[PDB]
Amino acid sequence: GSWFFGKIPRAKAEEMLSKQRHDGAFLIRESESAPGDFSLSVKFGNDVQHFKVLRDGAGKYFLWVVKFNSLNELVDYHRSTSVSRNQQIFLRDIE
Numbered sequence: 001g002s003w004f005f006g007k008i009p010r011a012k013a014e015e016m017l018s019k020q021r022h023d024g025a026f027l028i029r030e031s032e033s034a035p036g037d038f039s040l041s042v043k044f045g046n047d048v049q050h051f052k053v054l055r056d057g058a059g060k061y062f063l064w065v066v067k068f069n070s071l072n073e074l075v076d077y078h079r080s081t082s083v084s085r086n087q088q089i090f091l092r093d094i095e
Contacts, residue, residue: 001094003075005029010039010050016094017043024083024092028053028071038071042083042091051083 005013005027013029020043031039031052038053040063051063053074060067061074063083068074078091
């Protein structure tokens with residue numbers, strides 16, 4: 001299903017992802033910190049991590065240092081490059 005949840009509150013995103021069986025279950029939402037901000041929310045075991053997704057001066061999105069022309073490309077990238085640097089966790093659709 002669609003991974004984009006608009007303005008879902010942070011706590012509701014945590015509630016939703018905490019029910020998931022697979023690490024890497026995720027959503028993208030529109031977060032509260034600044035206008036236009038997105039956040040990637042991801043299940044890691046008993047935790048849900050939030051990662052701000054900001055835009056650079058060219059309009060590209062990023063979590064750390066790789067830049068993307070779209071949210072879909074950011075998601076695509078993390079279906080096969082881990083969102084953890086300690087263990088292999090790829091983004092996986094909510095079930």
